[PDB]
Amino acid sequence: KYQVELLEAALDHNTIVCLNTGSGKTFIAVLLTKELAHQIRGDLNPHAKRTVFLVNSANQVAQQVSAVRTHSDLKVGEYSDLEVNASWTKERWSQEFTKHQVLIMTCYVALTVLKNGYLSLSDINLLVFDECHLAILDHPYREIMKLCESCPSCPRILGLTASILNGKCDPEELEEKIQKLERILRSDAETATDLVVLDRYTSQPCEIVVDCGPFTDRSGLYERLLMELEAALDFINDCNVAVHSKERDSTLISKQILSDCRAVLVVLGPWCADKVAGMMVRELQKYIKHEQEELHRKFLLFTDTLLRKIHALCEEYFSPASLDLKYVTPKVMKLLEILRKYKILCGIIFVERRYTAVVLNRLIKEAGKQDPELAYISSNFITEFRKQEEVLRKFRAHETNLLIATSVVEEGVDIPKCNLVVRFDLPTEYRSYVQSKGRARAPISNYVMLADTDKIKSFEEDLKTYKAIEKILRNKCSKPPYVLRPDDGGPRVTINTAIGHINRYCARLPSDPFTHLAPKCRTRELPDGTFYSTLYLPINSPLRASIVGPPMDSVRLAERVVALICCEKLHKIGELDEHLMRPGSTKRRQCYPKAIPECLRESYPKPDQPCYLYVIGMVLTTPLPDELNFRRRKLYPPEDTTRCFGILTAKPIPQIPHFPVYTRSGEVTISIELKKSGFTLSQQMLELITRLHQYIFSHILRLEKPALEFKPTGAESAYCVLPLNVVNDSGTLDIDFKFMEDIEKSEARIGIPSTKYSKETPFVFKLEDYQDAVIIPRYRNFDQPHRFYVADVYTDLTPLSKFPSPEYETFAEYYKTKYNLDLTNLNQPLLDVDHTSSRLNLLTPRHLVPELCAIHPIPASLWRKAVCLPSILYRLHCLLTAEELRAQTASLGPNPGLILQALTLSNASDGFNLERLEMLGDSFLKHAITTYLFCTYPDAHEGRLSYMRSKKVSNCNLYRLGKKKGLPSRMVVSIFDPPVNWLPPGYVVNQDLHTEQCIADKSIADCVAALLGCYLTSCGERAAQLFLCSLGLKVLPVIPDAEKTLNHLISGFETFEKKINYRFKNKAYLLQAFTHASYHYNTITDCYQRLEFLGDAILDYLITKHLYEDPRQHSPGVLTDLRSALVNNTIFASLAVKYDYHKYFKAVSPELFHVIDDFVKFQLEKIEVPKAMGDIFASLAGAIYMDSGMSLEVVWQVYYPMMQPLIEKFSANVPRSPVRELLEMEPETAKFSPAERTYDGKVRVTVEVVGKGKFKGVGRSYRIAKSAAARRALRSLKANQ
RNA sequence: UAGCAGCACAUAAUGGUUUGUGGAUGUUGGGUGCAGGCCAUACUGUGCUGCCUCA
């Protein structure tokens, strides 16, 4: 609160302020400059009034000038070099004054230019004095000020200083310095320090003093120790008189060690110090070796001699195992009593030296362990480059209740509220008292001091002096009842609870660690003296207007009454109530039945209904390349064959797009085209068709699984498949009745033929009969058929020819010996054969003696065309399901091909996957939901928006909607394994892997997302938005001084508007965008948090669209990696800094200010990423979209040039998440071990790549450790490549 | 172009052994991390193969 009070005080009247550190100094300076900068902008004659800075030293000039230039928008000018400045003339300073707006110069230069008068006193606006204390002394600032005050119209001077309280006899010296300073500056002074502010607002801590008396040892060993200390001093004197070199100071370590020894012995016990001394001796021996002078080395050896002498005296210690409070310093007993009194216990102890702190911690720990009563003890200590990391680790260990610390604890650490601040010794200066007492912020705050009885005499007057200084500092700073309804509704309301209610209401509002929530109240003054209070809620509140009540004299009455009437408005908003206050998880899986399209259901042909016939046109569009071909059997284009299959059905089949299949010839396109229609069949003919269909199916494919049994009727899939041939030589295909009936009467219909070949009736071979032939060997595998295609006839090869193996000379010998088979004809040819395809999943690309054989009835050309029949029929079922879904949802529709892409899960391993559509649909879903919420509920804050958005887009909600609309029932998940899972038509299981599929809810949600991606990529944005309404997700509609204050407050954003290359028709949205929560002066508009919600969703949807439309068509892993990279907040922050948005951003949080000040120089070189930068970056995008009338394309032309240099870099070298990257490289062999906690508190994880090694990684979190382990694994694997 | 049993060698794995080395509460060294050198059990892959589907 002090920062806001100082800012508004400086705004109201000329202010003098005493600071503590340079951060606040620069901060208040630049902040007031920004606040009053509106008066400087504009090269207009009636107001050409500038701002000037006066400094004493060049180094500070450079520091401040650079800080202002970097973080300010106004151009800056410097006139520091006195000789150069003085070597100038009036007409050349003229253009210098005209050029820059902010001027910085040294004291001598300032006095020179003021003396000459060029810098008009009326042209200065904010005369800021740095190190204002110099004005007290005989400094040129006095002359400068008498000059300025001589003018009629004067600037708003400000004095900034930090050297106050440095006096000796402060109770009167400070008063005189303050009075003389203020009368010179003719202004009011305000002061603000952490402790004084905390005590002013709370005044909770209580101070306590504890007296201690000296204690000696009966053994007198203490005196022995003093005499060895004196011996050490004598040795140091001997070294001093014999240093023998002015440039050598190697004795410093020696006197430092002796100083530590005497200090620790006098203050506390020596045993801890003596024990810890050995570690320093381990380095001291190295220093001894490093020592060059033999005499000095000998002295340092005597230093070791002394240390071991004390070690020798340590033998006199009695029972070192436990001290029993018999040899410790009496202060230890006092400390133990203090600790026991409260024996929570969040205690902070202060001590002088670091070594003293270490030994004190050791002593306290040992006492706690030895004393059984000491059970609450949990102590730690505060104090190469590793030590800094250790300090950070110890900061993370802040949860310890007892912390010992040295003087460094006064700053640089956000210690929580403490209930017990122990001061082990008398503080040296009032400032130390301030910093030390400024930490006991707990309610039960006890600031306890430990002091020797003798020294209390001085400490008493010191305490008096300190409290007097605090008192003068404080003094200088000082200088009907509401009811819901008449009868019922809830509890009564009292006047005193109003402040508490307002406070908790303020606490309810959203905030981040950098912001602070607090209302502002002040009294309007009245001539009658009955000033009335006015209240202002934070900018994020739903309403922004002054709340007032009747005018009363009393402050308490006015404040409570204004709070009470405020509660009326809070309830009108609805903030007050009657009291005025797993599913969707990867684990869950369900089995669902498959569904057959309605067009295919009830398709059994019958004579009393006309029937339709479709032809399965097949064309070899893309034959396999010759180089790829290794099997080398000749290609078989099915178009040459006059025969072709077709589907006979009783109900028309809707059209479906052409689709491919992959077979021997390669990629063959299918066309299920209706060629003939409106024709019945005879009864007997119908039985012929049906029996032949069963015969062909069963025997050709051999899929008569005993679990299944045939049903001529009553099965859901009852569509017939038949062959066709050109009939009557008319070039028109038809059902070849003659061919079917001839095959039906074939003698080789069942079983192998028993040929009657003999020497009198030998076998005769006819090439034409074997031109197209499938032959079944008879002799081999009786009752176990094996079919082969005829490749070609090798007339040159005969049974009498030479056999390959040396076991037999000829094939005839092989047949006569291994099987004893007679051949009637000896001089007859042989032919080559090929094995019938054992594989049946053709849905995706994976890249003999004729006498013994028997001719199969069906020709091999038709057999080859039949091998694709199951694949084609299954794909037909899939496409028909997809088309039915598309038509139902339509009732310019989306392509069923994309629908198929959206309905197939990745587990199926199908060539058509389900990721790109998923990603696009998910992004669009988020954007649509966010836009709907923004439009439907204008009066809502970020908490409500974010919670409702996450609830609406919740995966459980998506699962519920999908199941409600029946969407999950349509996907395909199982890999196509027809031998196991396929249920062919006419066959059903006779009393699950056939009629049921198990799918996870995650996959269901992914499919629903893909559907959205499909519709967005096909039917356009409007149709995609309408799709959610079709799904039921409601996202479309059902179907006094403002101008002058805005005109002033807009300041100079025009120079930014030219950078963004765009101008809004309404100026309110710029202010909406950049209005931070802390800059409460803007009472006209809302904050930026509301614009964050819309801006993020806009930029996410735009970036996802741009990545998806990339013609490279990266894999889903790359897409996910790129999405995470582009959406990363560090990236958005870097982009904001690259385009200097921070130069125009305005905020009040000093912590945020310092963080940004560091962050900006970090990027200027080219580390905490400030969240505000990303927030403003998103909010600007939201502003562009809001003014553009819901036109995304306009936002794209604005932001694409901004993003263009980054996407090129990322696409050129995509950063791949190590986790998913490893999972993709080794989806099965990579196994991650459970989380293991190491002794240092970190988590160790082991990843095992089966067959490639185990890798261990350590990290603060399980995810980080996994990432490190994956990185190590990938690095090893690539090194091994 | 099928199935299966041995052999050479690489691998990391679960156990140990031993030389060196580390900061550490180090009551006078068993708490723990990383290099070399060995012993046992066990996994995968290319070859040396061998038998055995079909001709």
Author numbering: 46 to 388, 441 to 480, 497 to 592, 612 to 713, 739 to 1004, 1033 to 1076, 1290 to 1389, 1543 to 1590, ...
Give the original sentences from the paper that presented this experimental model.
In the pre-cleavage state, the PAZ domain anchors the 3′ end of the pre-miR-15a, but not the 5′ end, in contrast to the human enzyme binding pre-let-7 (Liu et al., 2018; Tian et al., 2014), likely reflecting the absence of the human-specific α helix in the PAZ domain. The β sheet face of the dsRNA-binding domain (dsRBD) binds the central double-helical region of the pre-miR-15a, in contrast to other members of the dsRBD family, which typically interact with RNA via their α-helical face (Stefl et al., 2005). Overall, these interactions are characteristic of the Dicer closed state and position pre-miRNA away from the RNase III catalytic sites. The closed state may allow Dicer to recognize specific structural features of miRNA precursors, whereas it would impair processing of mirtrons and dsRNAs because they cannot be optimally recognized due to steric hindrance in the pre-cleavage state. Importantly, the RNA-bound full-length Dicer closed state is virtually identical to that of the apo form and is stabilized by the same residues at the DExD/H and RNase IIIb interface. An interaction between the DExD/H and RNase IIIb domains locks the rest of the helicase domain (HEL2 and HEL2i) in a stable closed state in which Dicer recognizes miRNA precursors by anchoring three elements: the RNA ends, the central region, and the terminal loop.
Vertebrate genomes carry a single highly conserved Dicer (Dicer-1) gene (Jia et al., 2017), which encodes a ∼220 kDa multidomain protein that appears dedicated to the miRNA pathway. Cryoelectron microscopy (cryo-EM) of human Dicer revealed a protein architecture that resembles the letter “L,” with a complex helicase domain at the base, tandem RNase III domains in the core, and Piwi/Argonaute/Zwille (PAZ)-platform domains at the cap (Lau et al., 2009, 2012; Taylor et al., 2013; Liu et al., 2018). During miRNA biogenesis, the PAZ domain, which has a strong affinity for substrates with blunt-ends or short 3′ protruding overhangs (Lingel et al., 2003; Song et al., 2003; Yan et al., 2003), binds the base of a pre-miRNA stem loop and the two RNase III domains function as catalytic “half sites,” each cleaving one strand of the double-stranded substrate (Zhang et al., 2004). The helicase domain, which has a clamp-like architecture of the RIG-I family of RNA helicases (Fairman-Williams et al., 2010), is located near RNase III domains and is composed of three globular subdomains: an N-terminal DExD/H subdomain (HEL1), which is separated by an insertion subdomain (HEL2i) from a helicase superfamily C-terminal subdomain (HEL2).
